[PDB]
PDB file of C-alpha atoms in Angstrom:
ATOM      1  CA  UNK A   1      -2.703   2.033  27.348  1.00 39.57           C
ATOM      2  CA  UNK A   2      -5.626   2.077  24.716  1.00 40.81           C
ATOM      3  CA  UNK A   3      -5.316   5.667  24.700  1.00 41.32           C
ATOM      4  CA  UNK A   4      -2.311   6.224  23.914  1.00 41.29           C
ATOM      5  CA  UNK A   5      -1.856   3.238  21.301  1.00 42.73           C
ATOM      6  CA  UNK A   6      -4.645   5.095  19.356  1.00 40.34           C
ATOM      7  CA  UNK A   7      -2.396   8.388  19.126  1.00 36.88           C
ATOM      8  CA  UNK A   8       0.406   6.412  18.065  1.00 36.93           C
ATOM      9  CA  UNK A   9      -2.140   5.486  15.111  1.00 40.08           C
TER      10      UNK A   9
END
């Protein structure tokens, strides 16, 4: 999840 909230950054 962390992951791929940072890409949405």
């Amino acid at each position: 999840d962390v992951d791929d909230l940072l890409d949405m950054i």
